[PDB]
From a paper:
Here we introduce the first crystal structures of the B. thetaiotaomicron endo-levanase BT1760 (EC 3.2.1.65). As typical for GH32 family enzymes, the BT1760 comprises an N-terminal five-bladed β-propeller catalytic domain and a tightly packed C-terminal β-sandwich module linked to it through a short helix. The distance between the nucleophile Asp41 and the general acid/base Glu221 in the structure of BT1760 is 5.2 Å suggesting double displacement mechanism of the endo-levanase reaction with retention of the configuration of the anomeric carbon atom. For BT1760, respective amino acids are Asp41, Asp169 and Glu221.
Residue numbers in the entry: 15 to 506
Write the structure that this text describes.
Amino acid sequence: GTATYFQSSDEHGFSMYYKPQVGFVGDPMPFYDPVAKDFKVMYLQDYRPNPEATYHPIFGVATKDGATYESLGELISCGGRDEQDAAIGTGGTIYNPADKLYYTFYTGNKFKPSSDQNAQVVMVATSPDFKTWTKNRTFYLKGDTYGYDKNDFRDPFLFQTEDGVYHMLIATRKNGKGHIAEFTSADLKEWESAGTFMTMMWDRFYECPDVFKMGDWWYLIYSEQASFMRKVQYFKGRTLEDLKATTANDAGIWPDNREGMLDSRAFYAGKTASDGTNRYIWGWCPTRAGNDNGNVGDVEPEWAGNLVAQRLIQHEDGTLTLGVPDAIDRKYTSAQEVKVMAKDGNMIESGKTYTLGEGASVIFNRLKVHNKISFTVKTASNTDRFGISFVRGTDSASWYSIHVNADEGKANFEKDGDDAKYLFDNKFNIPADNEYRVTIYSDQSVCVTYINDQLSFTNRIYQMQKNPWSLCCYKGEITVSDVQVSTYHHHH
Ligand SMILES: [Cl-]
Ligand SMILES: [Cl-]
Ligand SMILES: [Zn+2]
């Protein structure tokens, strides 16, 4: 009925983009449990603030589908203040059918290490049922034992190849240069160094590496540590040696025309797992200081937030994009009436289509709490620009928009209105036919925008829930059609 701004909040609760009752979701460690036939997503549990020295214990959630989550609680606790794993960093899980134990390798971060100590050491815990985890008190894998780094030696990724060999990939350095080191084992207990799997481009550092085969392609997914990037990226190759060659001697053989950038700065630490039908990626969407959508960090965003699952889309040429998990899409079952609450500028309404010239905007009726928004936008030219706006009340001085800038080949997240400012961007393939098929899935303040199976754009938008949303044209002219909204909760 109203289209004024309302001060919504996140206390109502999340659902598909999970958050624990207390704290926030840091780096996830997804794993397909071959016995339970579901996904176990371990994750670094973050608190605001964290204790000194002993922080980021490993908690877990279980999910069949990336939409419905069961809390598993604390699984691997921090070591004591003075122990090697006082603070725990990211690792990886794998099942061993020979001894029927789950193995989780992880990073032990020493508090205030001395010259002779290692800031980071890879350690392990096992469990027969995924509920009770037992640390191996004699396993300590040190980078400098094998010529790698004493202090950067982290994020172990585990996979078993078809020949039965277990592989562990660890993000580290050799003589300062970033190296993903490989170790091999027959039993997950005794390990040998296989040298360097891949070097990291230039002075980059690849957090949370993830290597897998999908169809006829091998992939490395990683999260760039460099502050100017802070995005999930990937490389591809038809063979493992082709994959490893993409960065050899800084070759920079990008997998596609966007340096393999899958999402932008509000989706981080993405790693994958497959149930044999779909391969999903789990990452986190950061919180914002003061819950201010325009405070995205001076250098890097805040660390940790909400768990976000996406589905890998493999294209005929082997490139990857991300789409919504089908089970998330199916959560939005309650169709809502779509009504125009406000129009401004040079535009025309043609029934259930709207054509907006430069400067024009249409405001639609208030969203609910967990929303699926869909519509089609056709631009007049391949250099036009349009906006998808949230938290835009008729009385709002500022709001937040995804700018789709066809002339620049990318979508931006920006603050609009008073104190407008560009925040970050997300390159994607512009449609030759100028048609943009848009879907947005939201869960309170977390949403992902998908376009044409090409763009996947996660954003933190506090108070998008229970507030109007809007479409606008910045440059050129657009026609909006087929506007639909469906919600999670059902009313009568
Ligand atoms: Cl809802
Ligand atoms: Cl309900
Ligand atoms: Zn709800």
